[PDB]
Design a protein around this ligand. Structure first.
Ligand SMILES: O=C(N[C@H](Cc1ccc(O)cc1)C(=O)N[C@@H](Cc1ccccc1)C(=O)N[C@@H](Cc1ccc(O)cc1)C(=O)O)OCc1ccccc1
Ligand SMILES: [Zn+2]
Lengths: 308, 324
């Protein structure tokens, strides 16, 4: 333990001494290579130290006007490497990712296809890394990638693994872009089929249940006979799944929302039954469920006063 | 599925006096100096939690005020520490502290305002500093700073609202930027922003409240998004978010309280991340703030918007109407 203490006490002396020298160098106005090596040392272990990323940027900006095209091109490739080594160690620092956009945003021809491949690498390591997905969205835009490949990219990632909340969210933003209206039914139906598949494959998979609730709201009876049969078919599949997972709260809730989506008043008795079974399985959500049930019983009272 | 398991001999009692002493003594270590890059906010967290416990006098006002004036730069923004660079985050923290102390003219208020104004973009967003990072975190830092100062009118508020709303997602939550996935820390920033700008009627509270309350794991702790482990930080953000939107009761208050108390270190004091992990002033503030919002009578009432004593906000006449 004393060697671990003493080394970290020195890593201090070294983090502290390097930090000190960087700031000394900064008032002085020595915007040079010295600073890049010192910050290279500090930023590797603490990339949340934001001021130092700023120094690096300042040095690099100064040397775009003391070095040649070639010398400056070498500096950025060196910066790219540095960045990638910083990300392997902390793939979740805001400053590292923003420095990478900063750098790439000011290059002449940047290799965006390289950068999209980097995101695919980082996303197989951590499919939930929101910083990586945000960076991927930046690279896609900077490089005028079309919503269809990004949507094709999302097809892959769901089937491959079960860390899909981030992928289903991306789908939720991409589909509106394929059909830009201030969802079409054919599309809704196709997406409804992807999602049930996902949650019968793995019923404990909460992300698909959440995406599915969105799909249910996304545009009564103006229920076509197709949609009406698809929803009815979804309802029985969840009952089947309820017999298999009596503890599964997500399919129970979904059953309630399906019946709402079909016919509030006709399925009123079973909705009430379903709320009680559900509150018995998910007691922590007791209050939410009572409030949902009250909201629906109000809607059911409004629908009945529209009578004759 | 992923959850912490609380031990039977984790604390179930509130150790106020241990926490005050922990905060009163914090700063007299290793990760203390490793965290100089967020010193200003670190000071905010300690000061704020001490004041929530009525123990503010035990901190060094005079010293802290000098530190602050020396952290304001010529652009008018404020840095995290001396010699570090200005940023919206530390500008917020400095103004929150100056407001705790009724001492805002310690800094140049007009310069701060201009600084905050300078960082707004065409589409209504805010950059964190001159290097251009856009994040709804900074939309909150700007309007939070400006409202504690009475200068919300200084920025294009309509465009700011429009940007924040473009970050609203299919699940009723918010992320960093348009297209960004929903996350509890971003939900807190955006709902706090909409509270300040009077736009809570634009939130789908039942849909967002559902997403939020599904954060609570069987341990009683809350996570920041699906599949993640619960902790005290996410516990504050979610709860505070729920309270802003009128839905704090959608959570099991008893189970959450007990989670938070299990995060106390009964020997050293302070609060930790999750039970028996190592304590810090960040989770100490958010543990105490979280317990106050749940209704702990030993702790002053805490604003879920500014994460400051209500009584502080009452003095300066800034109290956003919340949903319900
Ligand atoms: O950056 C943050 N939040 C903190 C740290 C912080 C807070 C205030 C500051 O002035 C400076 C740093 C944070 O933990 N961020 C989060 C995410 C987030 C996103 C949006 C909104 C809130 C949180 C984060 O990335 N945390 C990381 C690591 C981390 C953990 C603790 C910490 O203090 C800083 C970073 C993790 O959870 O692993 O957002 C600013 C903010 C939040 C709430 C109120 C005002 C301002
Ligand atoms: Zn945390």
């Amino acid at each position: 333990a004393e060697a671990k203490r003493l080394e970290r006490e020195q890593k201090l002396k070294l983090y502290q001494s390097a930090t000190q020298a960087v700031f000394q160098k900064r008032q002085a106005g020595e915007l040079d290579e010295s600073v890049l090596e010192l910050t290279s040392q500090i930023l590797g272990a603490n990339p949340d130290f934001a001021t130092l990323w700023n120094c690096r940027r300042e040095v690099l900006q100064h040397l775009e006007t003391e070095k040649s095209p070639e010398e400056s091109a070498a500096l950025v490739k060196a910066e790219l490497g540095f960045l990638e080594s910083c990300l392997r160690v902390n793939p979740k620092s805001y400053g590292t990712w923003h420095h990478r956009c900063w750098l790439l945003s000011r290059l002449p021809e940047p290799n965006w296809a390289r950068e999209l491949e980097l995101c695919a690498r980082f996303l197989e390591a951590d499919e939930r890394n929101f910083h990586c997905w945000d960076y991927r969205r930046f690279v896609a835009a900077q490089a005028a990638v079309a919503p269809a490949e990004e949507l094709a990219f999302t097809d892959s990632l769901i089937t491959r693994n079960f860390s899909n909340y981030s992928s289903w969210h991306y789908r939720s933003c991409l589909l509106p872009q394929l059909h830009p209206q201030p969802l079409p039914e054919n599309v809704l139906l196709k997406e409804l089929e992807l999602v049930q598949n996902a949650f019968f494959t793995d019923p404990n998979d909460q992300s698909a249940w959440f995406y599915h609730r969105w799909l249910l709201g996304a545009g009564r009876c103006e229920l076509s006979v197709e949609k009406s049969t698809v929803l009815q078919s979804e309802l029985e599949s969840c009952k089947e799944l309820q017999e298999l997972e009596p503890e599964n709260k997500w399919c129970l809730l979904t059953i309630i929302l399906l019946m709402r989506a079909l016919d509030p008043l006709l399925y009123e008795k079973e909705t009430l039954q379903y709320f009680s079974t559900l509150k018995a399985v998910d007691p922590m959500r007791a209050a939410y469920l009572d409030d949902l049930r009250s909201k629906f019983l109000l809607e059911n009272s409004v629908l009945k006063m529209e009578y004759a | 599925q992923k959850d912490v398991t609380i031990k039977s001999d984790a604390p179930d009692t509130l150790l106020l006096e241990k926490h005050a002493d922990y905060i009163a003594s914090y700063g007299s270590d290793y990760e203390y100096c490793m965290s100089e890059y967020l010193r200003m906010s670190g000071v905010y967290w300690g000061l704020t939690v001490m004041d929530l416990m009525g123990q503010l006098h035990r901190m060094n006002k005079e010293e802290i005020l000098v530190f602050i004036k020396s952290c304001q730069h010529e652009c008018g923004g404020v840095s995290a520490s001396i010699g570090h660079d200005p940023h919206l985050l530390y500008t917020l923290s400095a103004v929150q502290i100056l407001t705790l102390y009724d001492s805002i003219h310690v800094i140049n208020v007009d310069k701060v305002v201009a600084y905050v104004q300078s960082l707004q973009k065409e589409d209504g967003s805010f950059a964190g500093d001159i290097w251009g990072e856009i994040d709804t975190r900074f939309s909150f830092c700007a309007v939070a700073t400006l409202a504690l100062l009475g200068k919300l009118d200084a920025i294009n508020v309509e465009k700011a609202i429009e940007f924040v709303l473009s970050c609203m997602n299919f699940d009723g939550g918010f992320g960093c930027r348009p297209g960004s996935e929903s996350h509890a820390g971003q939900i807190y920033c955006c709902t706090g922003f909409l509270a300040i700008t009077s736009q809570l009627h634009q939130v789908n509270s039942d849909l967002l409240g559902w997403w939020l309350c599904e954060r609570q794991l069987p341990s009683g702790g809350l996570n920041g998004r699906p599949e993640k482990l619960p902790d005290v930080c996410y516990s504050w953000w979610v709860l505070a978010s729920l309270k802003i939107i009128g839905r704090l009761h959608w959570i099991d208050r008893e189970k959450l309280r007990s989670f938070i108390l299990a995060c106390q270190d009964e020997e050293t004091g302070g609060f930790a991340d999750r039970p028996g992990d190592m304590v810090d002033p960040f989770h100490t503030l958010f543990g105490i703030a979280g317990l106050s919002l749940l209704g702990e009578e030993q702790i002053k009432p805490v604003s879920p918007v500014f994460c400051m004593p209500e009584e502080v906000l009452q003095r300066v006449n800034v109290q956003p109407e919340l949903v319900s």
